[PDB]
Amino acid sequence: REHWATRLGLILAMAGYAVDLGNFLRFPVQAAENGGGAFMIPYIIAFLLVGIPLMWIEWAMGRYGGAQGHGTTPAIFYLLWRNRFAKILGVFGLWIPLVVASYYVYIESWTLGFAIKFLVGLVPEPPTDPDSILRPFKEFLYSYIGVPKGDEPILKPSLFAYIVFLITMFINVSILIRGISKGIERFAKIAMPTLFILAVFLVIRVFLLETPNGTAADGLNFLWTPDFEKLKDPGVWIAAVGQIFFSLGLGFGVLITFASYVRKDQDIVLSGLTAATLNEKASVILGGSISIPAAVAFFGVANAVAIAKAGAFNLGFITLPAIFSQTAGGTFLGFLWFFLLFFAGLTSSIAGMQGMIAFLEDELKLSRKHAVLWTAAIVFFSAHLVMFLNKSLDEMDFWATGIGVVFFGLTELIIFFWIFGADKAWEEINRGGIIKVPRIYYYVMRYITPAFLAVLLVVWAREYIPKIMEETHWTVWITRFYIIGLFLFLTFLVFLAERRRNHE
Numbered sequence: 127r128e129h130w131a132t133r134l135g136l137i138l139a140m141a142g143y144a145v146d147l148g149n150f151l152r153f154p155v156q157a158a159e160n161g162g163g164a165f166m167i168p169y170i171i172a173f174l175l176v177g178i179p180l181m182w183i184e185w186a187m188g189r190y191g192g193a194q195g196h197g198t199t200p201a202i203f204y205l206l207w208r209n210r211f212a213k214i215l216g217v218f219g220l221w222i223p224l225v226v227a228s229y230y231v232y233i234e235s236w237t238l239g240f241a242i243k244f245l246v247g248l249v250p251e252p253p254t255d256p257d258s259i260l261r262p263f264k265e266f267l268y269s270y271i272g273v274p275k276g277d278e279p280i281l282k283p284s285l286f287a288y289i290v291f292l293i294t295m296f297i298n299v300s301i302l303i304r305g306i307s308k309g310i311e312r313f314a315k316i317a318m319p320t321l322f323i324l325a326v327f328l329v330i331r332v333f334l335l336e337t338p339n340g341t342a343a344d345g346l347n348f349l350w351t352p353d354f355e356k357l358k359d360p361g362v363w364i365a366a367v368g369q370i371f372f373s374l375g376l377g378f379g380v381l382i383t384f385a386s387y388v389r390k391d392q393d394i395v396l397s398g399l400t401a402a403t404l405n406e407k408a409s410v411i412l413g414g415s416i417s418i419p420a421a422v423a424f425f426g427v428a429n430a431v432a433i434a435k436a437g438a439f440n441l442g443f444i445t446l447p448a449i450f451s452q453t454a455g456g457t458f459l460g461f462l463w464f465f466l467l468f469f470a471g472l473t474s475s476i477a478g479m480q481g482m483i484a485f486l487e488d489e490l491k492l493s494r495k496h497a498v499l500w501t502a503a504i505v506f507f508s509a510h511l512v513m514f515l516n517k518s519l520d521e522m523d524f525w526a527t528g529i530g531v532v533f534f535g536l537t538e539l540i541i542f543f544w545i546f547g548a549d550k551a552w553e554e555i556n557r558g559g560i561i562k563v564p565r566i567y568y569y570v571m572r573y574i575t576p577a578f579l580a581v582l583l584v585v586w587a588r589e590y591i592p593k594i595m596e597e598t599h600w601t602v603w604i605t606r607f608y609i610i611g612l613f614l615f616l617t618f619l620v621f622l623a624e625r626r627r628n629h630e
């Protein structure tokens with residue numbers, strides 16, 4: 127079985143996964159809408175009661191399973207719990223990241239495409255007024271995606287967008303086919319530094335932004351000034367727990383798979399806590415210093431609320447490109463910005479797609495080459511639903527992310543710590559640990575963490591399901607049809623996996 131070559135490379139791969147577009151876009155938007163600096167109170171709390179505990183647990187289950195040659199949850203859940211159901215529950219952690227890959231790698235391709243379009247200067251050049259500057263870029267993006275101009279829910283992506291998507295897929299395969307060490311780890315050692323450099327460079331450039339409408343200091347002001355009155359809202363405390371979950375990448379079965387390449391007695395306590403810290407630093411220091419400030423600097427603090435309510439997607443693909451077109455040498459900035467995003471995704475997409483590679487290797491005894499190619503084949507095929515069918519992307523995101531993560535995490539907690547036994551689990555976490563987990567975290571992992579995840583479940587159940595189930599167009603059933611079909615298909619492979627083992 128493959129293994130991580132260097133302790134550093136492990137942390138950089140793990141952090142590479144956690145650091146993504148969410149760091150630079152989603153996190154700054156969530157903070158501004160939920161108390162600003164006051165949002166740090168429920169965010170840090172969720173990081174300590176839910177994020178950190180679950181991080182150690184997925185690392186634990188991973189290494190525990192990796193020692194026995196199994197990187198995926200259909201096998202691992204069957205080692206913690208020896209039930210027919212546990213294999214089935216485990217399919218979700220094989221199903222979830224495969225659904226994400228079905229649309230993320232594509233979104234990742236956009237950044238690459240925009241990065242190229244900006245580097246060669248093939249971008250709109252306005253013209254004055256905000257809607258006169260944004261619209262050429264709002265339309266620039268829509269021509270790439272192929273946003274429907276009619277009542278039809280049909281996307282028509284440009285030939286370029288499709289070709290970049292193919293190139294992007296190819297790039298992923300290139301790294302993935304070289305294995306864990308000479309591929310993922312080797313790239314994590316290049317990507318993360320390059321990522322940091324670009325972030326700092328952009329940060330410095332943004333602080334020097336001065337327009338008649340405001341400055342970057344106005345952006346850091348609006349973002350970090352604390353509105354404690356919003357801490358009364360449960361929704362802020364829900365968004366915080368959700369964000370931490372989302373930022374660390376919990377519930378996707380990616381940490382589990384990655385940590386299964388960690389050797390049996392190697393540290394996971396300190397190593398995980400490090401990678402988790404790298405992610406958070408990137409979010410508050412780098413990410414919160416580029417997007418929101420620059421937006422406020424150019425449009426003034428007057429629109430800072432309107433900008434934040436415009437969503438993370440608009441901020442990153444319409445707003446920020448439009449601002450760069452108005453700055454000295456801004457075409458290059460667009461290139462640095464999109465190339466910054468590109469790597470941030472590429473370091474996550476190679477992680478997300480490793481779970482399916484691992485399964486085919488571990489359970490179906492496929493070579494790494496075959497396991498990589500077939501995984502690429504599945505993702506490429508399924509993506510056409512995202513590329514061509516409007517709002518398919520959102521349906522996959524909704525189900526996979528939302529439910530998947532919350533439900534799976536709570537499943538991971540119960541199986542490992544309640545079913546497999548808390549004491550056996552706690553030892554599994556602290557074993558080989560450079561530092562030991564604080565004795566108080568035993569109670570957090572056993573009660574506080576699943577309580578949070580459960581209240582999150584209930585709130586989530588009440589607010590978002592009734593919405594998607596009735597008010598959405600009928601075409602969502604196509605996406606539902608397909609993502610259900612995937613789960614059935616993955617059930618079947620798991621079935622074939624166990625039938626092959628009884629023979630040998």
Ligand SMILES: CNCC[C@H](Oc1cccc2ccccc12)c1cccs1
Nearest residue numbers: 143144223226227230373375378475478
């Ligand atoms: C927070 N770090 C990774 C984010 C996570 O990343 C992934 C998580 C799981 C599988 C993935 C497969 C391909 C690409 C990214 C994947 C997601 C991003 C967007 C929706 S879910």
Ligand code: NA
Nearest residue numbers: 144145146373
């Ligand atoms: Na993150």
Ligand code: NA
Nearest residue numbers: 142470473474
């Ligand atoms: Na990444």
